Amino acid sequence: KAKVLLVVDEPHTDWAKCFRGKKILGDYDIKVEQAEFSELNLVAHADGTYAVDMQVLRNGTKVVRSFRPDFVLIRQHAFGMAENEDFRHLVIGMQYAGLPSINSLESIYNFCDKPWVFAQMVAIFKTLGGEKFPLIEQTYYPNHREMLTLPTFPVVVKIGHAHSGMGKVKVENHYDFQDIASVVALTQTYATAEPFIDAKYDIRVQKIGNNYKAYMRTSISGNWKTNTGSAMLEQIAMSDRYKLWVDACSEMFGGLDICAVKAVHGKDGKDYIFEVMDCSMPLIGEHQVEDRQLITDLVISKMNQLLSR
Amino acid sequence: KAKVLLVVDEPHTDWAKCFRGKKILGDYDIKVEQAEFSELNLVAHADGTYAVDMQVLRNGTKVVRSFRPDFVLIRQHAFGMAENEDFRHLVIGMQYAGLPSINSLESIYNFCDKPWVFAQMVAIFKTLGGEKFPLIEQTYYPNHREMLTLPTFPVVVKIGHAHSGMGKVKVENHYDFQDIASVVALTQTYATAEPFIDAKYDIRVQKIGNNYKAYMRTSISGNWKTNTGSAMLEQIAMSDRYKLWVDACSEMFGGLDICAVKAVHGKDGKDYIFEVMDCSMPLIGEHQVEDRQLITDLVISKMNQLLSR
Numbered sequence: 282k283a284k285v286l287l288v289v290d291e292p293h294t295d296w297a298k299c300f301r302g303k304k305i306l307g308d309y310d311i312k313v314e315q316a317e318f319s320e321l322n323l324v325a326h327a328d329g330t331y332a333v334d335m336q337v338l339r340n341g342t343k344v345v346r347s348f349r350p351d352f353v354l355i356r357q358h359a360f361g362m363a364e365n366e367d368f369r370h371l372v373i374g375m376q377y378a379g380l381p382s383i384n385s386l387e388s389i390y391n392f393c394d395k396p397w398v399f400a401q402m403v404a405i406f407k408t409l410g411g412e413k414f415p416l417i418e419q420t421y422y423p424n425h426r427e428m429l430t431l432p433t434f435p436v437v438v439k440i441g442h443a444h445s446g447m448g449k450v451k452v453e454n455h456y457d458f459q460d461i462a463s464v465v466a467l468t469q470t471y472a473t474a475e476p477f478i479d480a481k482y483d484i485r486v487q488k489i490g491n492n493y494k495a496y497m498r499t500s501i502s503g504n505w506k507t508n509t510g511s512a513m514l515e516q517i518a519m520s521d522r523y524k525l526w527v528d529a530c531s532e533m534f535g536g537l538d539i540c541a542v543k544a545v546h547g548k549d550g551k552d553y554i555f556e557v558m559d560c561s562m563p564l565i566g567e568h569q570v571e572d573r574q575l576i577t578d579l580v581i582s583k584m585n586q587l588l589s590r
Numbered sequence: 591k592a593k594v595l596l597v598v599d600e601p602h603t604d605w606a607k608c609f610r611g612k613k614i615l616g617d618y619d620i621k622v623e624q625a626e627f628s629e630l631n632l633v634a635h636a637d638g639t640y641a642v643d644m645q646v647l648r649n650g651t652k653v654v655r656s657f658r659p660d661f662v663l664i665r666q667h668a669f670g671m672a673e674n675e676d677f678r679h680l681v682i683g684m685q686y687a688g689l690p691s692i693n694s695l696e697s698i699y700n701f702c703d704k705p706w707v708f709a710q711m712v713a714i715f716k717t718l719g720g721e722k723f724p725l726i727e728q729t730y731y732p733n734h735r736e737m738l739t740l741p742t743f744p745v746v747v748k749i750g751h752a753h754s755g756m757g758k759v760k761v762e763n764h765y766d767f768q769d770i771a772s773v774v775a776l777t778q779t780y781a782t783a784e785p786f787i788d789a790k791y792d793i794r795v796q797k798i799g800n801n802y803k804a805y806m807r808t809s810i811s812g813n814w815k816t817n818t819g820s821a822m823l824e825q826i827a828m829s830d831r832y833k834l835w836v837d838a839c840s841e842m843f844g845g846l847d848i849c850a851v852k853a854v855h856g857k858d859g860k861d862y863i864f865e866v867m868d869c870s871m872p873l874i875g876e877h878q879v880e881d882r883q884l885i886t887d888l889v890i891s892k893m894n895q896l897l898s899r
């Protein structure tokens with residue numbers, strides 16, 4: 282018959298299409314349920330039973346369908362400190378129900394705090410050394426009171442856990458740093474400060490299963506936050522230097538099937554790794570369909586090794 | 591020539607007394623810094639250096655010694671949903687600094703959500719079967735809205751993540767349950783419902799390193815919350831059944847050096863496991879100086895294992 286795959290992602294990608302005609306376990310076909318965290322909810326019981334109910338509006342047709350997934354593919358961020366971005370309660374629920382998934386719910390839960398992820402990168406840094414793993418120097422402030430300890434300017438300050446540029450400020454001098462700290466005191470959260478790199482371009486090394494791919498990204502808007510606004514994106518060739526980067530990061534939290542390393546290439550010719558992203562990394566470049574193909578394969582491969590008749 | 595040990599615990603226990611004279615790595619002495627989470631703060635850097643502050647009411651109204659721990663022993667809860675009980679930011683910081691500790695900062699971070707820990711127990715339950723691992727049945731509500739899925743009464747509803755009775759309520763019918771849910775809508779969090787078991791006494795099976803102890807508590811106060819007022823506590827004899835319980839739970843999140851299974855023993859002569867505690871379990875009974883000794887040994891053992899000259 283068919284197995285139920287829940288894909289948590291936005292409408293602009295048609296995962297039901299991507300898994301069209303594909304088979305698993307020889308005869309079992311694949312039923313895709315797609316929706317975003319904001320549209321999902323569920324209930325789970327210690328005895329193995331659970332039920333997810335999607336709520337979406339398709340063609341003026343407000344849907345309230347219910348179902349029981351046998352596997353999850355997650356493509357969104359489970360946490361964010363802006364309003365209505367908090368979906369940890371759901372990832373917890375899906376682990377409570379024991380759902381198999383990509384990436385593992387374990388890793389997704391742990392990726393809900395950037396500094397916690399960065400701490401894993403710091404450990405890889407201690408293990409590989411700078412030449413091979415050039416981690417940007419960063420300072421972690423559990424809250425605003427420790428920000429009396431001043432970093433070398435200029436720095437980029439990144440407040441809490443947020444996405445697409447949110448909570449990130451370039452800070453050029455001491456007075457302006459005291460001002461930002463006084464604001465961090467109102468967000469009542471943690472913050473980081475790392476050197477502002479004068480950059481030629483962005484670098485993103487990705488890993489989907491066993492497929493590697495490197496991209497570069499130059500701005501055309503005058504903004505240092507090279508995302509949003511607008512920027513010329515082109516693919517570059519994979520080197521082993523790059524491969525070692527995403528390979529080492531992909532081992533954390535028991536293993537990430539899908540992840541990417543973010544780095545800035547400075548005018549001084551040096552790379553600075555500043556973040557690792559997991560299964561919620563957006564697909565980019567002119568090879569997206571390609572990547573979705575790779576992911577599809579991944580989900581099938583994992584469903585076969587983990588599911589039962 | 592000494593290694594600094596930070597112990598996170600209340601002022602009535604005197605950890606500097608337990609480590610007096612003890613040596614690590616042959617000839618290094620141990621310098622103990624003790625304080626509660628509410629009095630600590632720190633800053634850590636990717637390059638590997640960090641620094642901790644301890645603000646205690648001494649020599650005046652506020653004095654602040656500073657120091658650099660080489661190991662941490664944590665005895666308090668790191669998270670709590672009542673006011674001024676969130677210290678997840680300090681645990682992330684200690685991990686960012688790469689601090690070795692007991693229990694591991696990894697397991698401490700994952701113990702900040704009861705339902706997430708319980709999801710581990712559900713898996714242990716699925717592996718072992720109910721006769722050997724009698725896990726209480728429980729239902730997980732991501733939020734108050736799924737609470738239209740009524741359970742079988744009477745149940746104990748446990749709201750959010752709290753301790754020592756906080757946020758737990760007995761509910762006997764579906765009207766009272768609709769009122770508790772509407773409250774869960776004000777706390778804006780997750781909640782669980784499990785059957786209310788009429789009990790003879792509580793059971794706690796603890797594990798410190800390789801030492802096991804079982805204790806029982808019978809209430810003389812009245813209401814079901816046995817942890818209230820006066821209660822008959824005593825060490826009783828270990829058994830294979832009990833040992834298997836805490837040994838299977840001690841495996842989660844990479845391993846717990848210090849943990850405890852809590853269960854209620856029903857009038858129907860049965861055992862109901864309802865929670866697992868970690869290194870923040872309070873020391874109880876009359877063998878506390880004994881246990882403080884076992885723990886002390888543990889910390890010396892781990893320091894010799896993980897530290898360097």
Ligand SMILES: Nc1ncnc2c1ncn2[C@@H]1O[C@H](COP(=O)(O)OP(=O)(O)OP(=O)(O)O)[C@@H](O)[C@H]1O
Pocket residue numbers: 437443444445446447449475476477478479480483505506507508543545555556
């Ligand atoms: N230390 C830095 N020096 C220079 N540029 C930086 C630095 N940190 C970030 N940037 C620039 O800002 C952009 C966005 O920052 P970052 O990726 O950290 O934020 P984000 O919210 O995670 O973004 P998204 O959610 O879109 O991935 C980067 O792609 C990069 O061009």
Ligand SMILES: Nc1ncnc2c1ncn2[C@@H]1O[C@H](COP(=O)(O)OP(=O)(O)OP(=O)(O)O)[C@@H](O)[C@H]1O
Pocket residue numbers: 726746753754755756758784785786787788789791792814815816817818852853854864865
């Ligand atoms: N399902 C249940 N049915 C009946 N009694 C229960 C149930 N779950 C918990 N209890 C009882 O409720 C009391 C409070 O539980 P909880 O686990 O929160 O406290 P505790 O850690 O034992 O208390 P303390 O911190 O005082 O030692 C305990 O005595 C426990 O046995």
